[PDB]
Design a protein around this motif. Sequence first.
Motif, PDB file in Angstrom:
ATOM      1  N   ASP C   4       0.808  -1.216   0.000  1.00 41.92           N
ATOM      2  CA  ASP C   4       0.000   0.000   0.000  1.00 41.92           C
ATOM      3  C   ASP C   4       0.843   1.269   0.000  1.00 41.92           C
ATOM      4  OD1 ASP C   4      -2.895   0.762   0.079  1.00 41.92           O
ATOM      5  OD2 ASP C   4      -2.238   1.896   1.841  1.00 41.92           O
ATOM      6  N   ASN C   5       2.127   1.175   0.350  1.00 45.29           N
ATOM      7  CA  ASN C   5       3.058   2.288   0.219  1.00 45.29           C
ATOM      8  C   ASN C   5       3.639   2.379  -1.188  1.00 45.29           C
ATOM      9  OD1 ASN C   5       4.372   4.461   1.898  1.00 45.29           O
ATOM     10  ND2 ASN C   5       6.223   3.442   1.140  1.00 45.29           N
ATOM     11  N   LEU C   6       2.936   1.827  -2.174  1.00 44.36           N
ATOM     12  CA  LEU C   6       3.415   1.746  -3.546  1.00 44.36           C
ATOM     13  C   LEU C   6       2.239   1.338  -4.425  1.00 44.36           C
ATOM     14  CD1 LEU C   6       5.799   1.068  -5.821  1.00 44.36           C
ATOM     15  CD2 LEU C   6       5.804  -1.159  -4.674  1.00 44.36           C
ATOM     16  N   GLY C  34      17.980  -1.817 -11.317  1.00 45.70           N
ATOM     17  CA  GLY C  34      17.089  -0.714 -11.614  1.00 45.70           C
ATOM     18  C   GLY C  34      17.857   0.585 -11.615  1.00 45.70           C
ATOM     19  N   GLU C  35      17.295   1.570 -12.310  1.00 43.29           N
ATOM     20  CA  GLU C  35      17.938   2.871 -12.396  1.00 43.29           C
ATOM     21  C   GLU C  35      17.979   3.539 -11.024  1.00 43.29           C
ATOM     22  OE1 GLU C  35      16.427   5.397 -15.429  1.00 43.29           O
ATOM     23  OE2 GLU C  35      16.387   3.833 -16.969  1.00 43.29           O
ATOM     24  N   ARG C  36      18.719   4.640 -10.948  1.00 42.54           N
ATOM     25  CA  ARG C  36      18.777   5.405  -9.712  1.00 42.54           C
ATOM     26  C   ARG C  36      17.428   6.055  -9.434  1.00 42.54           C
ATOM     27  NH1 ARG C  36      19.500  10.870 -11.146  1.00 42.54           N
ATOM     28  NH2 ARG C  36      20.110  11.141 -13.336  1.00 42.54           N
ATOM     29  N   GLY C  37      16.955   5.922  -8.199  1.00 43.35           N
ATOM     30  CA  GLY C  37      15.728   6.585  -7.815  1.00 43.35           C
ATOM     31  C   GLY C  37      14.447   5.943  -8.297  1.00 43.35           C
ATOM     32  N   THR C  38      14.450   4.641  -8.615  1.00 49.75           N
ATOM     33  CA  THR C  38      13.223   3.944  -9.014  1.00 49.75           C
ATOM     34  C   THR C  38      13.071   2.635  -8.224  1.00 49.75           C
ATOM     35  OG1 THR C  38      12.034   2.902 -10.865  1.00 49.75           O
ATOM     36  CG2 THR C  38      14.446   3.063 -11.073  1.00 49.75           C
ATOM     37  N   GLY C  39      12.494   2.752  -7.030  1.00 47.96           N
ATOM     38  CA  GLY C  39      11.889   1.625  -6.348  1.00 47.96           C
ATOM     39  C   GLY C  39      12.821   0.597  -5.748  1.00 47.96           C
ATOM     40  N   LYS C  40      14.139   0.790  -5.832  1.00 48.81           N
ATOM     41  CA  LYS C  40      15.054  -0.212  -5.291  1.00 48.81           C
ATOM     42  C   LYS C  40      14.814  -0.427  -3.802  1.00 48.81           C
ATOM     43  CE  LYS C  40      19.179  -0.810  -8.088  1.00 48.81           C
ATOM     44  NZ  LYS C  40      19.671  -2.141  -7.639  1.00 48.81           N
ATOM     45  N   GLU C  41      14.779   0.659  -3.029  1.00 50.49           N
ATOM     46  CA  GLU C  41      14.631   0.549  -1.581  1.00 50.49           C
ATOM     47  C   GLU C  41      13.274  -0.019  -1.177  1.00 50.49           C
ATOM     48  OE1 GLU C  41      17.234   0.964   0.082  1.00 50.49           O
ATOM     49  OE2 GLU C  41      18.520   2.264  -1.128  1.00 50.49           O
ATOM     50  N   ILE C 224      11.665   8.701  -9.055  1.00 49.81           N
ATOM     51  CA  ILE C 224      10.764   8.895  -7.928  1.00 49.81           C
ATOM     52  C   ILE C 224      11.165  10.087  -7.068  1.00 49.81           C
ATOM     53  CG2 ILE C 224       9.597   7.809  -5.995  1.00 49.81           C
ATOM     54  CD1 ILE C 224       9.007   6.591  -8.710  1.00 49.81           C
ATOM     55  N   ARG C 225      12.457  10.240  -6.770  1.00 50.35           N
ATOM     56  CA  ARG C 225      12.900  11.420  -6.033  1.00 50.35           C
ATOM     57  C   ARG C 225      12.551  12.696  -6.787  1.00 50.35           C
ATOM     58  NH1 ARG C 225      12.921   8.373  -3.369  1.00 50.35           N
ATOM     59  NH2 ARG C 225      10.967   9.469  -2.910  1.00 50.35           N
ATOM     60  N   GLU C 226      12.884  12.742  -8.079  1.00 52.10           N
ATOM     61  CA  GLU C 226      12.577  13.923  -8.875  1.00 52.10           C
ATOM     62  C   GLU C 226      11.073  14.102  -9.030  1.00 52.10           C
ATOM     63  OE1 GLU C 226      11.234  13.617 -12.031  1.00 52.10           O
ATOM     64  OE2 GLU C 226      11.483  15.607 -12.920  1.00 52.10           O
TER      65      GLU C 226
HETATM   66  N1  LIG Z   1       3.475   5.461  -2.991  1.00 47.55           N
HETATM   67  C1  LIG Z   1       4.640   5.758  -2.367  1.00 47.55           C
HETATM   68  N2  LIG Z   1       4.655   6.162  -1.078  1.00 47.55           N
HETATM   69  C2  LIG Z   1       5.805   6.460  -0.444  1.00 47.55           C
HETATM   70  N3  LIG Z   1       7.016   6.381  -1.024  1.00 47.55           N
HETATM   71  C3  LIG Z   1       7.148   5.988  -2.314  1.00 47.55           C
HETATM   72  C4  LIG Z   1       5.938   5.644  -3.073  1.00 47.55           C
HETATM   73  N4  LIG Z   1       6.346   5.291  -4.306  1.00 47.55           N
HETATM   74  C5  LIG Z   1       7.699   5.402  -4.334  1.00 47.55           C
HETATM   75  N5  LIG Z   1       8.179   5.805  -3.143  1.00 47.55           N
HETATM   76  C6  LIG Z   1       9.606   6.044  -2.803  1.00 47.55           C
HETATM   77  O1  LIG Z   1      10.493   5.613  -3.839  1.00 47.55           O
HETATM   78  C7  LIG Z   1      11.760   5.361  -3.225  1.00 47.55           C
HETATM   79  C8  LIG Z   1      12.656   4.420  -4.023  1.00 47.55           C
HETATM   80  O2  LIG Z   1      13.971   4.594  -3.500  1.00 47.55           O
HETATM   81  P1  LIG Z   1      15.184   5.057  -4.451  1.00 47.55           P
HETATM   82  O3  LIG Z   1      16.495   4.578  -3.875  1.00 47.55           O
HETATM   83  O4  LIG Z   1      14.987   6.524  -4.751  1.00 47.55           O
HETATM   84  O5  LIG Z   1      14.934   4.221  -5.800  1.00 47.55           O
HETATM   85  P2  LIG Z   1      16.069   4.145  -6.941  1.00 47.55           P
HETATM   86  O6  LIG Z   1      17.039   3.105  -6.446  1.00 47.55           O
HETATM   87  O7  LIG Z   1      15.293   3.759  -8.174  1.00 47.55           O
HETATM   88  O8  LIG Z   1      16.659   5.535  -6.996  1.00 47.55           O
HETATM   89  C9  LIG Z   1      11.459   4.848  -1.826  1.00 47.55           C
HETATM   90  O9  LIG Z   1      12.335   5.471  -0.884  1.00 47.55           O
HETATM   91  C10 LIG Z   1      10.027   5.270  -1.564  1.00 47.55           C
HETATM   92  O10 LIG Z   1       9.969   6.122  -0.417  1.00 47.55           O
END
Ligand SMILES: Nc1ncnc2c1ncn2[C@@H]1O[C@H](COP(=O)(O)OP(=O)(O)O)[C@@H](O)[C@H]1O
Lengths: 256, 259, 256, 258, 30
Positions: C4-6, C34-41, C224-226
Motif C-alpha cells: 500500500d506504500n506503492l 534498476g535505475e537510480r531513484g526507481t523503487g530499489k529501496e 521517484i525522487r525527482e
Molecule cells: N506510494 C509511495 N509512497 C511512499 N514512497 C514511495 C511511493 N512510491 C515510491 N516511493 C519512494 O520511492 C523510493 C525508491 O527509493 P530510491 O532509492 O529513490 O529508488 P532508486 O534506487 O530507483 O533511486 C522509496 O524510498 C520510496 O519512499
Amino acid sequence: EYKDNLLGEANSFLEVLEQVSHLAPLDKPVLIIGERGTGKELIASRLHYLSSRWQGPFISLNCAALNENLLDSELFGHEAGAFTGAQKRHPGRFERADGGTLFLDELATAPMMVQEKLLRVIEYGELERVGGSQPLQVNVRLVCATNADLPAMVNEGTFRADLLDRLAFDVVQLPPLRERESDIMLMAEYFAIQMCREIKLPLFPGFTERARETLLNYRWPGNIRELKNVVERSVYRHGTSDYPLDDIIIDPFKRR
Amino acid sequence: MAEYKDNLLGEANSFLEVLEQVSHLAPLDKPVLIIGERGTGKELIASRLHYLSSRWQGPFISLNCAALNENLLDSELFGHEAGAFTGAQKRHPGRFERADGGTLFLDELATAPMMVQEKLLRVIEYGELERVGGSQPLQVNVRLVCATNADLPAMVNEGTFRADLLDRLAFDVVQLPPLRERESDIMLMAEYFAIQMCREIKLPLFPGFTERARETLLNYRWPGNIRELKNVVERSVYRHGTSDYPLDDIIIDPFKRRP
Amino acid sequence: EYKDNLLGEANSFLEVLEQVSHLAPLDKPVLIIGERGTGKELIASRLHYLSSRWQGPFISLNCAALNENLLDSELFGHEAGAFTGAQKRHPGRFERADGGTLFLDELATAPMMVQEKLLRVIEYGELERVGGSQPLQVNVRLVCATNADLPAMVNEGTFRADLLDRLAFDVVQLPPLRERESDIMLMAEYFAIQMCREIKLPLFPGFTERARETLLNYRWPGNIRELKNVVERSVYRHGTSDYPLDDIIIDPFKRR
Amino acid sequence: MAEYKDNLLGEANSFLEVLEQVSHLAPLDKPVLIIGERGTGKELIASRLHYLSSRWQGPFISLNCAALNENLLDSELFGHEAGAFTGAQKRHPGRFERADGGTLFLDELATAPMMVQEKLLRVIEYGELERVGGSQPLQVNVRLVCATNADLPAMVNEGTFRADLLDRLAFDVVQLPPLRERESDIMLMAEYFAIQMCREIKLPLFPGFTERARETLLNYRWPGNIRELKNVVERSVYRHGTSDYPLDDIIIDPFKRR
Amino acid sequence: MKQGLQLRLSQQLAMTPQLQQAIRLLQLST
Ligand SMILES: Nc1ncnc2c1ncn2[C@@H]1O[C@H](COP(=O)(O)OP(=O)(O)O)[C@@H](O)[C@H]1O
Ligand SMILES: Nc1ncnc2c1ncn2[C@@H]1O[C@H](COP(=O)(O)OP(=O)(O)O)[C@@H](O)[C@H]1O
Ligand SMILES: Nc1ncnc2c1ncn2[C@@H]1O[C@H](COP(=O)(O)OP(=O)(O)O)[C@@H](O)[C@H]1O
Ligand SMILES: [Mg+2]
C-alpha cells in the motif's frame, strides 16, 4: 585427483596437461598464456597439487585489485608497525605462504616498481621489507597468468626486459574455446549433470536440436565462465526433469 | 680472509683483463662505477669487489634506485628517529647507517631522478648524514659501488643528470665486455649451465652439443649476454629431457608455437 | 502486504511484483537491477516483509557512500579479534543483521577485496574472521542490488567475474517510469493529497490539461525522487485550492 | 515566530516577492536552498527563515562547511559520550544534536570536501546518528537550510560535487536578485550606510549627496553586491571630510594609481 | 599512502601528584 574437473578431449589440452606434468616437480617459474575465462586458476591448482610438496600453503589471490601503494602492502606487508597506518606486523603475501607456490593474476597490470621488485626477489629469495629492515629469504614457486602479448608491451618498454626473460622461463599457452569444437557438447553435458545433482534433480532429460544449433552458433568469449553460467541458468529456469531442455538463457541481463 | 671466488666461469680475453683490473680496486677506498649492458653479470663483480676488500666482514646491503617509494624515499635513504613524525613507534635504522664498514650497492643510477640525486648529493663526499627528525648528526664511512645501463655523459649533456654527482662518483669506470662481442666463452658458459641443469633434473649425465646448435649460437644477436643464455640452455635441455644425444635444436624463444 | 506504500501498473511493475512473489520463499540471494531513484529501496523492504523473512532484523547499507577501509571494517571488522587500535571494535552491520534481511546497495562501486570477501562470505555461508579461525555459520538472508550493467565493467575487469557469475540466477528488473506511462497521474494525486494533509490545505483541486501534457512530455531523469520534488514544488507554488494546478517546476534553478 | 530585529530594507519590488516566498516557507520543515551571488545578504534571509519558524525557540547554530577538519570530521559532527579525561562527568557535543530542536544553517556548500559530502549525505536520509563508541542510535529532528553562490549543476557535471545529496536537499530553492537587478533601493541603502558611518567615525552631521555622485553610483554595472556598495560609501564618506560641503566624490575602486 | 601528521581521539586519562601518591600507596606490603 580433485575430481580432475574440466576434462579435455582436445589434443591441445592433452599436450598442455602433459607438459604441466613435467613442470610439476621442478621449482621453476611457469607462465600460463590463458585468456580471461580460460584456465583461470585451473592449471595453477594442478601445478601446486602435483609438485614435490603439497603442504606449502596455496593462498594465491593476487590480481589487479589494488593500486600500486596498496599492492605493495599486499605483497610484502609492514615492518612491525614502523610507520603510519601500521599497528602491528603484517607479513604480507610472500611470507604468508612459504614452502609452496603463489599465483599472480593480471600481472601485466602491475606497476613497474613491483615488477622490478619481483625481479629482485625471485632470484635470491630475499624479501626486503617495506620498513627497510634486514631481508628475509623464503623459497616459493611462482605461477603467472596473463591475457595479453608481453613481447609488444615490452617493445614499448613497459615491461622490464630482464623480468620478462627471467620469469618467462617456460610458457604454457592454452586453447581458447572457439578452437574447441567437439567438447562443447561434452562441457554442456557435464555441467548439466553437475547442476541437476546440485539442485537434486532426479535425472537429466537431455538436450534438443534447437539448443544444439544455439550452442553451435555462438562465440563464447569466456572459455569456461561464459558457458557454465548459460547452461546452469538454462537448467535452473527449466527446473524439471520430465522434458528435455529447449530454452537457452543467453545473457542474464537482456531486457524482459 | 678467504678467496670468496663464488661462481666464476668463462674467463678469457678482455673479461680476464677486467678481472685483473678489478682485483686491485678493493684495497682502495674510492668510489667505483661499473658500465655494462643489461644483464652482463655486473652484480657478480660488484659483490666480489666487497669480498676482496680488507674489511670484507662488513655487512652487505643492496638498494635498487628503480624501486624507491617516493613517499618513503627520504626515510629509507637517511633514517628516521623515534617520534619524529606520527606513527613512528620506534627508532628505525636507515639504509646508509645500516652499512658501516660494509659496502652499499647502488643500481640504476641512469634512472635516478633529480629528486634522489639532490637528496643524496652531499652524504657521499663527506660521509655525513642527519636523520629526519634528528637532533644530532652521524658520520659513517662506506665504499659506494654503482651499476648502470646508459651513457651518463650523454645524460649529462641532456640535462637530466648532474655533473656534480657524476664527478662525485667518477673515479674509475669498469667496462664489462658483452659476451656477444667476446664470443670466446659462449661454449664454456653454455656447457657449464648444461651440466648444472642436467644435474638438478636428476639425470644420469649430459650428452654432447650438436654442431648445428653451435652454428646457430653465434648467429644470434644475444641481447641477453649471460642472463638469457642460461635460460635458453635450461629450457632447451628440459625440452629434450634425455641423455640420448646432443640436443640438435635450441629453443631460443619460448613464445614460438610447438608446431 | 506492505504494498500500500506503492502502486504498480502498466504491465511492467505488475510483472516485477509477480516475480518478487515467486522468488520470495527463496532465502538465497537474488539480484535486483534498476535505475537510480526507481523503487530499489521499497522493493528491498518488500522482500524482507514477505512471509519467508518477516521475522529477522533487516538492515540496508549503501556501499557507494563509504570508503574502502571503512567499508571492509563495517561489514566485518574485529568482531572477536584483538589488535592494536580499533578499540571497542563492533562486529558490524553484517553480523548485526545476521538472522535477518540484508540489502547492500550499489555493488558496482565497491572495492575489489571487499567484493572478493563478500563472495567468500555468500558462498557456502562462511564468514571469515581474523581473530578467530572459526567462521560464522549463522544463516544469512541477503540479496544483491546494483544499477549499472555489471557485465560492462567486468569486461574491463573493474568487477570480480565470479561474484557476478555466482548470483546471476535471479536477475530482477526495475524499469524507469518513462515506460510506465500510466502510473504518473495517480502517484501524483497521492503525493498531492499527502502534502495537502501535511500543510492542512482543505482539498486537492486536481490537475489541468496543460499540466498533464507537460508531465507526460518530460523525460524524467530522476524517477521517484525527482517526481516527488516536482509534484511537491508545484503544489507549493500553487498554494491554493480554488482552481486546479497549471504551473509546475521541474528545474527550480530556472529564473522566472 | 517573533520577527527578529534585522535590517532588510526592502523596496525593490522584487526583494518583496522574495520575502513573501521565504515567509511562505517559514512554517514548513522541508529542506530549503538559498541561491544567490557574492554578498547579497543571504545570511539575513536564512536567519529570517529560522527565526520565523515554529522551532524558532530552538537553537540556531551555523556551521562553516569549509571550516570542518578532515580527520576530526566524525567526532566534530557527532561527538563522543566518553569524556576527554578518565572518570569525566560530561562529553563534548557534535555539530548534530546541538541543532536538534532548531534549524541547522550550512554555508559554502559547494566548497564542502567529498568527505563532508558523503558523511553528511548518510546522516540526513535516515538520522539515527551514533557517537563514536557504543551501539545506541539516537534519533534527531533537525531542519536544514543552506545557501551557496557557486553553480552546483556545473559542480555535478564536473563531478566534484555529488548529485545525490543535492537531489535530496533541493526540495525548493529561493532566488535572490542582485543589487543591479534591484536598481531602486540604492539611495536608501546608501543613506543608511552613511548614517551608520557617521556614528562610527563620530562625524557630526551628514552633508548630503550631490547629483554627480548619484549619477555615478547609479550608472554602474555593479558586479559587486550590496556589501561592495556598502564599502564604496564607506570609502567616499571618509575621504570627503568633515561635512562642511555636500559629498561630491565617489571612488568606485581604491586601486587606480593616480 | 603517506607520511602526514594526523590526529584522532579514542581515549581519555587524567591524574594529579597526590593521586599518584595514593596509587603508589597500594604497591607495598602492610
Ligand atoms: N506510494 C509511495 N509512497 C511512499 N514512497 C514511495 C511511493 N512510491 C515510491 N516511493 C519512494 O520511492 C523510493 C525508491 O527509493 P530510491 O532509492 O529513490 O529508488 P532508486 O534506487 O530507483 O533511486 C522509496 O524510498 C520510496 O519512499
Ligand atoms: N663469470 C661468470 N660465469 C658464469 N655466470 C655468470 C658469471 N658472471 C655472472 N654470471 C651470471 O649472470 C647472471 C646475472 O648477473 P647480473 O647481470 O649481475 O644480474 P643483474 O640483472 O642483477 O645485474 C647471474 O645469475 C650469474 O649466474
Ligand atoms: N537588506 C540588507 N540590509 C542590510 N544589510 C544588507 C542587506 N543585504 C545585504 N546586506 C549586507 O551585505 C552583506 C552580505 O553578507 P553575506 O550574506 O554573508 O554574503 P554571502 O552570502 O555572499 O556570504 C551583509 O554583511 C550585510 O551587511
Ligand atoms: Mg640487477
